[PDB]
Nucleic acid binder design. Structure first.
Lengths: 269, 216, 318, 312, 99, 283
DNA sequence: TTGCGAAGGTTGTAGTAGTCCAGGAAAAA
DNA sequence: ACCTGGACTACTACAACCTTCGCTTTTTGG
């Protein structure tokens, strides 16, 4: 909350459209909090979309309480320098942005230990996250409301605490694509408690788009607010994704907020 | 047209607005004016008040349009001292009295709590089987169990509930603490038999809530 | 004697609150809003108020309710923004009224009314009278109010005359309740068409159950509830129970409010909703304009007059 | 629970709100207050008293379940506002949880026949003269209270009134007999209490403590009767004994059943002890609760309709 | 008819008049009320104010009779605060200035 | 900024000092222990009258003249006209061209009398409600008398005023021109004189030059212009108000209301312009 | 982890008027 | 021995925040 960098105006004339988008965010904030949100970002390369995304998403959140959101890249592996570059472009200290280095693990590796661990019947004791992954964060960690169940210093609690997260989409996809174990607990809690930003989505291969659609649907089903970001979005993809988000949002409104209100998503370009 | 002007300025702003307004209307109160004026006079009054306004200026103008009707024309300066109709708050305070943090809007929290708690109390029940106990006490080579313990738990639950019965039946039966007895295990349609019995989730086998609990 | 000096038909204010708490402060009934770092107290002139509709995130205390009842002011909870309080399957509940019980109302009208409500044919005659009055008022409002014409409400007189005459012919010939209901629906659709034409709105379709998204449907759904409040207070003031509906009871609980509301739901609500949607206004502006228009047309007086006349004619025919 | 028959609960010092789809009471005594054992179903009704508030969401939930709600005054009387009960007929069959009533039909089925109204008035008078005896004679607590009731004079007056009531041809004669019995009972109580000569001043102009006590007891009893008729579902205007013009007739007719048998002793006792208003109010409420008045009023009101339909 | 009421009350009288007048009209200012009302309600207002008035009470009522014309109906309490037409002095001073 | 006709206030002060206080123009009146300051809305005033026991400070006159308001002293009445403003010239040029020639000056003097008579006729025919034949006869007789010399015109006007006074007295049922009617007439005459001075200054014609009362007294044009409205409304108003048994202040407020309701200033200015135009036409 | 509104006491601020001293003005078309 | 503005100086009315504490209301034409 009260981050000056996202509020400061920009003097360079090449960076005025960012101010325009930031103003539109306030213009649309009120109705988005109640009905939803589905944003697009078609700024051409070289316009520094990262700062625009940060500022726009911050503007939507209520100023009194603060803001939370996560950034996901369509990259198989996220090198540390990329995360630090994101920090620099956003201008956030190491105490406010966690980085999830590495890539996703293999499915079959966990199997052999599980069969070995099945001798004791404690199959519920498997770690939530893989061992390779590490969360580079050094902020507050003592006043976690969920500290009891997730572990004092396990990766899960660190992931949940950080107000802003940077990761790859392969690290959130286990929310809906998980078939065994409890790999979907931490990312699902993250989805419920925060918001989402997808970056370079069309970088995905053609045959991986069903999974992305399912993730977007579930993201809309638990009260998040999605914002794609790229400059080469073919219309069919955008239409399909909007339909999925709306299908998810309709179910959510039954179980939250004032009953009876209509379903009018608050789109933007 | 006759209008009513009310000021809610403070500090030096008050003296300025008193100076500007007292040229057009007779003073009907310590902060109220009223007089018949023409349109041009009103426009020039608005201009003059706008020119020299400060942070602590708040002046409202009401028009008595006709019979039993009056409207708010404009507000000069701060707009947080009046609501839409031009009324003003009577009192103020800092201590919260709405205290709106006690009540939440999770309209299905209780259903989730009940379904989960009931599902929790039965979930690992299948670990009572002799094969499972022997595996627990077995230190030698392990043999994978012919059936997953969750499936055994589901079969035990299905046998207890009794096929084809409405929800209230098994709910009441369970709730009655006096009722005890192992006479309902004769309906445990084991899946090791030569003829495979129908799946527990078919329409005639379980009532709705039973299936909701069984899935978990 | 002191608080109730002003008659119900001469009071001016009608209220619709949200996100507020109603309580007694220093001997007065006030509602408190929130502004972040401060809270404000706003006063309510109970001696100049008729009804009170409470929306979302509201609450009220016993002392406030005791004060309200003493002055004969009705209170009713409603789902915010024109949507019903509670809806499920075929169940619907638009408002949950809390009528006063400490006051004693006249005994003539109740006795005359209950003296026919248990007779089918007399109920049919009462319904016919209701519809006749509705058509007459519609013609009066649409062809005799110059304020609507000045605001920009223009309708081809000939089409309106044709529609109303056809409706009157069909209505008076209705043999049973169902024909009356269907004919009323037909007239409603025709009036929708005419109103849409008058202000060049274009193509319009009326949704149901508050599922509309275009401004016209939302404005109409919200404007319905003000009529419900006026009808409720009009029925109470005469001492007639809300349950003794004559036309709409078959589909609602406490139908007489809906029956007596229909007299006004088309004379001043439809034109004003369409005008506002054309202007691109918002909920607050439409609500304010509609309330002013009702007060200028003296709707509550008309509702009371019609109820008295229907009861008297029912008695006389016997 | 004021009455076992009505199933009517009373709440005080409590905030009613909803947390996760369930109505919750917050009050001192935490999660041990017995307000958690209130069946929320079609067969419940809630009355909120001193120091209470209700949220809009709570009343949405209550309406979903089908529970009526009313705001009463300190102790359960008087009634300020409440919901309304709809009628039950072959037609007019909406889909809602609220359970409707049927006594309005039976009541209206005879109120238009003058002779049946005469029979009903007779029944009311008989009930009052019956209860006066029990209150003024059998009560051991009242006997220990201090005011001394002479059996002979009270029996003579009760028998005389019973004879007069049985032989009243028109309403006016019944009213005259009622006035005579009231005056005689007033005199007997005044003699018993040693208060001296007393009268029932008009407009409540009487400055003596007895006048104030009588007015306050009257106000409490009218409130209780209003609750009674609301619970049952009959309207206030449909008077039985009073004139057809006098507004609120039925409330006073039903209220009279208990007034002369419960209020009268208490006012004189308080005047003799010279107590304040609050203590007198508390004493009246305690006596009303012990005598279980509301149950008797409801039972009598149903019994009249039952007899009218049986004799039909 | 619509009316404009201005309160010049002082000390304890201020709270009482604020309590009574708040039942009938909305507040347009720290000491100003304005709403439409009927003659009977206005008479009740005046009577109630007179009954419980004190030495410091000062209330005035103006009537907007028509277009570009207004009248003073009555004053309750001290009439020294208002002049004949109903206006109010802008300032006071104990120091003699007229001489 | 506001046309002089639109301004809706005219003051007549007494026992008060007019001074500037904190940049505002206010007048002070004693009360006893304390003294009071009442404000004058200069931008909504047409003229100001100072009675007995009042004084003014130059700093106030500066503001008054700056705003355009007019000032004058009474007890006939001496007027101070703000010279710091520049007024239209063409109307004055036409009026002086008319007034230079005695022959032309003779014409139209009865024209104002005719206009006043027409105004009286139109005004008499519903406020006075809250004989037509006799009134019409008197109007026709007056018109016949008015339509050779200026002295005859003055005598005819005096006869018309006497007849109107008699008719008004009959309607009231109470006249001689000590009674409250005479004092009320004097006060109304003072107020009408103020309105006439205001209108003439608004037009820009010189006050000194007169029409029919020039020999009578200084500034005869003001009295002549006042006569039109004086006959039209001052008489019935004063008669009714005196009959009601009302104080001077009540009568004055009533007269101001009646003049305001009638839009008298517009009447007088339009009639003055019309007379000037017709006189120019005759030339 | 715990109602609701009133009365009395305490604490802080804006607002009003008296005192004394100093300067004396308004800028077209 | 003139007349306003400004700076400075008391010095009261207002308003809210903190503690206890009782819980009604005339109740009359019904």
């Amino acid at each position: 909350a009260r981050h000056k960098g996202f509020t400061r105006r920009v003097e360079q004339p090449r960076f005025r459209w960012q101010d325009k988008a930031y103003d539109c965010a306030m213009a649309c904030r009120e109705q988005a909090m109640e009905h939803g949100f589905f944003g697009l970002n078609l700024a051409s390369t070289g316009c520094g979309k990262t700062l625009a995304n940060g500022r726009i998403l911050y503007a939507l959140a209520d100023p009194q309480r603060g803001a939370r959101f996560s950034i996901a890249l369509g990259l198989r592996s996220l090198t540390l320098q990329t995360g630090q570059a994101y920090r620099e472009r956003l201008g956030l200290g190491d105490d406010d942005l966690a980085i999830l280095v590495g890539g996703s693990a293999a499915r079959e590796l966990f199997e052999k230990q599980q069969e070995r661990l099945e001798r004791s019947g404690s199959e519920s004791a498997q770690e939530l996250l893989a061992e390779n992954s590490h969360v580079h964060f050094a902020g507050t960690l003592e006043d976690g409301p969920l500290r009891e169940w997730l572990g004092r210093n396990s990766a899960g609690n660190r992931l949940l605490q950080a107000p802003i997260l940077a990761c790859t989409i392969d690290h959130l996809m286990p929310a809906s694509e998980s078939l065994r174990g409890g790999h979907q607990i931490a990312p699902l809690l993250r989805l419920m408690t925060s918001d989402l930003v997808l970056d370079e989505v069309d970088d995905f291969d053609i045959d991986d788009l069903p999974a992305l659609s399912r993730l977007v649907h579930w993201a809309g089903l638990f009260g998040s607010r999605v914002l794609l970001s790229s400059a080469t979005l073919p219309p069919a993809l955008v239409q399909g994704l909007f339909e999925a988000y709306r299908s998810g949002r309709e179910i959510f409104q039954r179980h939250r907020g004032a009953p009876g209100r209509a379903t009018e998503i608050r789109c933007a370009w | 047209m006759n209008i009513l002007l009310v000021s809610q300025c403070e500090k030096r702003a008050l003296s300025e607005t008193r100076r500007i307004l007292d040229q057009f209307a007779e003073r009907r109160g310590e902060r109220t004016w009223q007089t018949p004026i023409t349109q041009a006079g009103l426009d020039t009054l608005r201009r003059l008040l706008k020119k020299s306004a400060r942070r602590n200026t708040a002046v409202a103008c009401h028009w008595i349009r006709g019979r039993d009707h009056s409207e708010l024309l404009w507000i000069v300066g701060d707009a947080s001292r009046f609501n839409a109709q031009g009324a003003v708050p009577t009192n103020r305070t800092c201590r919260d009295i709405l205290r709106k943090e006690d009540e939440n809007d999770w309209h299905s929290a209780e259903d989730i709590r009940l379904l989960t708690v009931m599902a929790a109390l039965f979930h690992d029940i299948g670990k009572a089987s002799q094969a499972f106990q022997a595996k627990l006490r077995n230190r030698g080579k392990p043999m994978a169990d012919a059936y997953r313990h969750e499936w055994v738990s589901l079969r035990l639950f299905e046998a207890f509930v009794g096929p084809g019965s409405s929800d209230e039946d098994w709910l009441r039966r369970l709730a009655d603490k006096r009722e005890t007895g192992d006479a309902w295990l004769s309906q445990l349609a084991r899946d090791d038999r030569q003829s495979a019995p129908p799946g527990p989730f078919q329409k005639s086998r379980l009532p709705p809530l039973a299936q909701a609990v069984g899935w978990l | 004697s002191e608080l109730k000096t002003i008659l119900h038909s001469k009071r001016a204010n009608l209220y619709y609150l949200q996100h507020c708490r109603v309580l007694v402060n220093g001997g007065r009934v006030e509602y408190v809003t929130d502004e972040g770092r401060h809270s404000h107290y706003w006063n309510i002139p109970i001696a100049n108020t008729t009804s009170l509709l409470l929306g979302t995130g509201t609450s009220i205390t016993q002392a406030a309710m005791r004060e309200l009842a003493r002055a004969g002011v009705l209170v009713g909870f409603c789902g915010g923004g024109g949507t019903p309080l509670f809806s499920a399957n075929e169940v619907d509940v638009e408002v949950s009224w809390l009528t006063p019980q400490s006051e004693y109302r006249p005994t003539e009208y109740l006795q005359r009314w209950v003296g026919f409500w248990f007779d089918e044919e007399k109920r049919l005659v009462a319904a016919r009278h209701f519809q006749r009055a509705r058509l007459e008022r519609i013609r009066h409002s649409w062809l005799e109010d110059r304020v609507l014409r000045d605001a920009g409400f223009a309708v081809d007189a000939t089409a309106l005359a044709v529609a109303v005459e056809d409706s009157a012919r069909a209505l008076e010939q209705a043999p049973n309740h169902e024909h009356l209901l269907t004919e009323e629906a037909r007239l409603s659709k025709r009036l929708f068409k005419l109103a849409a034409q008058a202000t060049r709105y274009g193509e319009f379709v009326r949704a149901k159950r508050g599922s509309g998204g275009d401004p016209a449907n939302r404005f109409l759904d919200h404007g319905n509830y003000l009529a419900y409040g006026l009808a409720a207070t009009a029925t109470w003031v005469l001492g007639i129970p809300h349950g003794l509906a004559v036309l709409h009871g078959k589909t609602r609980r406490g139908g007489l409010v809906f029956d007596v509301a229909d007299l006004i739901k088309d004379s001043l609500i439809l034109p004003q909703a369409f005008l506002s949607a054309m202007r691109g206004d918002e909920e607050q502006d439409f609500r304010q304009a509609c309330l002013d228009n009702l007060s200028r047309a003296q709707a509550l007086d008309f509702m009371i007059d019609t109820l008295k006349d229907v009861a008297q004619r029912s008695t006389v025919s016997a």
